[PDB]
Amino acid sequence: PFSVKVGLAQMLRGGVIMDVVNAEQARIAEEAGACAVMALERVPADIRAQGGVARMSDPQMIKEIKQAVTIPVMAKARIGHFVEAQILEAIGIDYIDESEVLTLADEDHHINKHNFRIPFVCGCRNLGEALRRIREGAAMIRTKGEAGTGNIIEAVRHVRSVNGDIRVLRNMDDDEVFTFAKKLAAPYDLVMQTKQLGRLPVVQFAAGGVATPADAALMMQLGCDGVFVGSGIFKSGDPARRARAIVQAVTHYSDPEMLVEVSCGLGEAMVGINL
Amino acid sequence: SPFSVKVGLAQMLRGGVIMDVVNAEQARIAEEAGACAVMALERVPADIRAQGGVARMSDPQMIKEIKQAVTIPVMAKARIGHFVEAQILEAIGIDYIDESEVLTLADEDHHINKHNFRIPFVCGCRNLGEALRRIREGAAMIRTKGEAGTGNIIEAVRHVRSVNGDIRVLRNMDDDEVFTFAKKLAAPYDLVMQTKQLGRLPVVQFAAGGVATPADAALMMQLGCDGVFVGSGIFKSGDPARRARAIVQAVTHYSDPEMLVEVSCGLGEAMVGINLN
Amino acid sequence: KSPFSVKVGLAQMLRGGVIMDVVNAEQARIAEEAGACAVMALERVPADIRAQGGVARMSDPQMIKEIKQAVTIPVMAKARIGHFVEAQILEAIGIDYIDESEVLTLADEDHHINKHNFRIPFVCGCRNLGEALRRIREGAAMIRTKGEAGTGNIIEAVRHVRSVNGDIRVLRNMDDDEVFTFAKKLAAPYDLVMQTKQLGRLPVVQFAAGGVATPADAALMMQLGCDGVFVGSGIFKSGDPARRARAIVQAVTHYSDPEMLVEVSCGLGEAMVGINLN
Amino acid sequence: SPFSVKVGLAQMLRGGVIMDVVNAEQARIAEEAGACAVMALERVPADIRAQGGVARMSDPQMIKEIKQAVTIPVMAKARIGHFVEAQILEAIGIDYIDESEVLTLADEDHHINKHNFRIPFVCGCRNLGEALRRIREGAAMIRTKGEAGTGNIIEAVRHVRSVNGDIRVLRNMDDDEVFTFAKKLAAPYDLVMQTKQLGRLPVVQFAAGGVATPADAALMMQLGCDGVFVGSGIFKSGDPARRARAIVQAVTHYSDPEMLVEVSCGLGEAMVGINL
Amino acid sequence: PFSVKVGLAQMLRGGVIMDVVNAEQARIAEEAGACAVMALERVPADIRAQGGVARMSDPQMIKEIKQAVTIPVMAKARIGHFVEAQILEAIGIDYIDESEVLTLADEDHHINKHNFRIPFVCGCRNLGEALRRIREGAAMIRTKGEAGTGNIIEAVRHVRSVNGDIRVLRNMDDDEVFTFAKKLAAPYDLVMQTKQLGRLPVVQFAAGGVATPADAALMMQLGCDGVFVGSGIFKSGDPARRARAIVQAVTHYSDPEMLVEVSCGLGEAMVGINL
Secondary structure (H helix, E strand, O other), rough: HHHHHHHHHHHHOOOEEEEEEEEEHHHHHHHHHEHHHHOOOOOHHHHHHHHOOOOOOHHHHHHHHHOOOOOEEEEEEEOOOHHHHHHHHOOOOEEEEEOOOOOOOOOOOOHHHOOOOOHHHHHHOOOOHHHHHHHHOOEEEEEEOOOOOOOOOHHHHHHHHHHHHHHHHHHHOOOHHHHHHHHHHHHHHHHHHHHOOOOOOOEEEEEEOOOOOOHHHHHHHOOOEEEEEEOOOOOOOOHHHHHHHHHHHHHHOOOOOOOOHOOOOOOOOOOOOOO | OHHHHHHHHHHHHOOOOOEOOHHHHHHHHHHHHHOOOOEEEEOHHHHHHHHHOOOOOOHHHHHHHHHOOOOEEEEEEEOOHHHHHHHHHHHHHEEEEEEEEOOOOOOOOOOHHHHHHOOOEEEOOOHHHHHHHHHOOOEEEEEEEEEOOOOOOHHHHHHHHHHHHHHHHHHHHHHHHHHHHHHOOOOOOHHHHHHHHHHOOOOEEEEEEOOOOHHHHHHHHHOOOOEEEEEEOOOOOOOOOHHHHHHHHHOOOOOHHHHHHHHOOOOOOOOOOOOOO | OOOHHHHHHHHHHOOOOOEEEEOHHHHHHHHHHHHOOEEEOOOHHHHHHHHEEEEEEOOOOHHHHHHHHOOOOEEEEEEEOOOHHHHHHHHHHHOEEEEEEEEOOOOOOOOEEEEHHHOOOEEEEOOOOHHHHHHHHHOOOEEEEEEEEEEOOOHHHHHHHHHHHHHHHHHOOOHHHHHHHHHHHOOOOHHHHHHHHHHOOOOOOOEOOOOOOOOHHHHHHHHHOEEEEOOOOOOOOOOOOHHHHHHHHHHHHOOOOOHHHHHHHHOOOOOOOOOOOO | HHHHHHHHHOOOOOOEEEEEEEOHHHHHHHHHHHEEEEEEEOOOHHHHHOOOOOOOOOHHHHHHHHHHHOOOOOOEEEEEOOHHHHHHHHHHOOOOEEEEOOOOOOOOOOOOOOOHOOOOOOEOOHHHHHHHHHHHOOEEEEEOOOOOOOOOOOOHHHHHHHHHHHHHHHHOHHHHHHHHHHHHOOOOOHHHHHHHHHOOOEEEEEEEOOOHHHHHHHHHHHOOEEEEOOOOOOOOOOOOHHHHHHHHHHHHOOOOOOHHHHHHHHOOOOOOOOOO | HHHHHHHHHHHOOEEEEEEEOHHHHHHOOOOOOOOEEEEEOOOHHHHHHHOOOOOOOHHHHHHHHHHOOOOOEEEEEEEEHHHHHHHHHOOEEEEEEEEOOOOOOOOOOOOOOHHHHOOOEEEEHHHHHHHHHHHHHHOOEEEOOOOOOOOOHHHHHHHHHHHHHHHHHHOOOHHHHHHHHHHHHOHHHHHHHHHHHHHOOOOEEEOOOOHHHHHHHHHHHHOOOOEEEOOOOOOOOOOOHHHHHHHHHHHOOOOHHHHHHHOOOOOOOOOOOOO
16 A cells, blocks of 8 residues: 555655765765665766766666665666666665656656555655655655755755645635645645645655755754755765764754764865856 | 535436526426426526626525426526525525526635535536536536527537547546646546546536527537536527427437427527627 | 449539529529529528628528428538537438538537538538548538638639639649648648549539629639539529529529620629628 | 558567667677667667768668678668668668668658558658658558657657557547547548557557667557667667667566566666767 | 750750869769769869858869860859859850859849850759749759758759649649749749740759769659769769769669669768758
């Protein structure tokens, strides 16, 4: 049942999921306290900088990451590429992220995720998208800012958008919810489920531009359940120290004294791009 | 579920003609002609179109006079979004409420939350997305609607073909594509899938808008509708009683051209109507 | 041998004829006595539909029966475009042809009647060759190349007859390899385009209609290559319907005889005044 | 009928991979990997894209060298509308002509009258209307085509879904509405009705455009194609022979995820391609 | 009389006319079986690539070409440059081509070719242009595609246009021909002459992008009387072999077996440009 997958993702709350491209990065991530590793071909900053078609990683590399760690292993598939997802599931990983950072394979339809046994992550920029991805079978939502820039601005925008719309929905006149669902282009039943629950019906992590402990704690204070870090660790001057600092920031997000400690003398952050 | 019971009650109307009536005399004509139900409203759509002014729910006294004049179901119209007009109609004790676009819209952004009511509702639609939105709000029956008050069937044909055509597309669609299809219709996914599984609308679907002749009514049935509403074509015609009977018989015998000739022969002046083009 | 070919063959019996719109039995008798090859039953002549407005539908079966009883020549009647039930009714009455007519109020803006579903032959209108071939593929056994309705102005009939016949002539010498693209551009079925090329003419009978007001107009349509003419308004909106109807019939029969055209046009009475839309 | 015989020949390629080749070495690699046919052309689509210049039929000498290097059927490309290139190809004795949009268009308004030839033709399409127009001109096989020379499958997915989706719409459609549907497709009505009756394209339909990995090839088959062409994704990759075999296996076993893992594992560098 | 010039050009039917820039190219052309050589400063591909004002060749070079061959010698003059044409005629060559490949000298008027004793070739893209050039005195028409690209697409377009309009005209209602002449902006008398003749009233060769034997045979199968080759020979890897193959293709244009033979192992074709 879908609810089993939704419940599984609850275990990741309070965690940092780290993009890794090889087994060495995966070991760094687990040693730093990541709650899961995300296997992909290149970190988003490199995909942005270099171009080319970005696809699912080779199964051999994913197997190498899978046997190098004991925490959950996720991997990315192109949007709509349900055969990449079939291969990932057959390898025996724990989650598939149908990821907009890879090159879109189907511009009109996402994967029918209910056809799979393992849980899926999907991205969103707004509540309507989040609920559409959930109805397709996403068990976890990544609210996504800019990929590969180190700039948190779009993550802040999109997190505030999703959470703000949920707060509006919570107090809305029931009679107006039908039109709200039409405007969101989202399934009414899921809209009402979100209204009664008072939060997103699945775990919601922030992603996109998280470069510093301060960024990660910010996402948590805005109400996210966790954070993805794609480029900010492995495009930085000291990946291992920075990864641990970000893990600590998510765990202690309301403790300014701790946030000072973990941020102090951390090395060159990812320089990134101001779009 | 209570909604399933309302949906099931409307099944009795299949094969029928629902006639708009403005007084007790028209209601008696409708019943004697064999209508499956009467629809109480202040003025027939052609008169609303010609005269203008704000069109509202009928006075409860007129609705009571109509309800006492007939034994077939009595429906009555309320303005879109005017949930208090609907409360009044339900408290009178009629059988269905039609949240009708022919009356002056009262809420441009929201329809009545029809699930809050005990009696069943009819709503109009022009396409499948609208039909399914109205159903999700609690409509137990759908009126696929063309032009009101013109005697011109062109838009009813267009909208019947649109709704039924989209259902046929949906029936055979790749399951993986239905998510995006629901998004494009701005319709609730679960209802889209239910329509896909059934191969038809989940509730009774009548045609309405410009039905003026027996041929028009039979056309709507051959296009796949479950029945027809006649708003203006009977009481703006030269012989309302005989034309009402002929339209009832056309719906009963919609696949029988010999019968359609018989009931159409020498019917008197039809509603002249208006060609908007 | 095919059912459609038989229908096409029936309409060919009307070559050289004038088909006259009629609204009652008196007009029908006037038409037959004038030499019309057929009468066309409709509620109002096109000039009256234009002037008066209102929704224009199939005539009441009672009136069609009265017309059918009053004449021995073939009886046609009009149905709205797409209104296949009106057509089912007309065929059940027992008339000879149905005209799916743009002069009545369109009932289906996107689809015409599937005319192959009927026993009796259909007439449809067209303004260009692509339209004519589409109507034929739907089952029309006869094409009415149509100008303006109800105005007495032949200008659009000339334009559309010249367009249809001109594209047919373009087909004759066309490189076979270019016909695929020509069919695409016409949005017409390729097999019917090739049949038109092979025949050097429309695969069904082609009459002109629209604004025929004088004998000269009718002979003009015949000299442009049409097989016959419809007269909708120009007879019964004129000052002497009976004499003008005979004159137009004679003009179609003797369209290449200027002396006859003079004789039948002389002292003919007031033509339909009509309207210049320009 | 002569056309039905040609349509029958192309049907024998179902379940296969057709591999673009530019020389006899690539041709041998293709056959040994299990390709169902080779496609002789001057340069693979990715090179045509990166280099520019007018792309034409290959020199007959190169086609003959490919033809005698393999025992599987040999196809070769001709420019759209270049019916003399097609006459020359047929006279060489090859098995199929692909009137190909990857070569430089020679006639912007008209395709080759393929019914005039003895050997079967492949044509590309992006939608059902185009496919049926090509079939009416005499194409015995249809290549539903995405982007050429980029390694990006997105447009092939779009066009395969478009063709297949319109075929599905046609199956349940009110017969009376089919006339207007054929007008809107600018397609011959008889071929529209034949597609409705069959519930599939009246000729074999292969996918092409951006197939770079075994997953891509299996995706095309699960979407309902009869086979795939690979133009650049093999010979612009790090290990053509092993990748060619893996793609053949993926088409043969497209609904077996375990097999798809096995043949995809440790394949080497795919073609990097371009995200337009 | 004009008819003498028109009749002279009939002798070229079935032939290939080859652009040459010096005496060596001219000898190659005649040895390969060209029906005439065309003397110009630079081949169209070089004019396109290099730019600059392209004019009539120096008389000395034209004299060198003239005494190096025994087949007819044509030379090019800029459009409207009637003094260049006067010089060419005084040299004693056989034809002048008033050529759009050279730099236009008069944007509004062509040479009054009836003022000359020797026949002229002019280009066209459509029937109206062809008939205007003929009325000015062109005894031969070059239906012209792209110059200097090796791409036949525009030649195919323009050949199909001219021949297609002639076929339309042949069957047209006589009464409609007046308006057809107006629409073509062509002289009515010449329009009617073309209608009664059923073909162009002068020899019509194709030109523009002919790069392979297949290209040349294609132009002949579309109904041309011959072909010009500007760049496709002397911008190719083996000019002499390719020139002979193209000559054979025009002579045997309906023989696929011959077309295979002459095309087989021909060397690098002109690479050209896809515009």
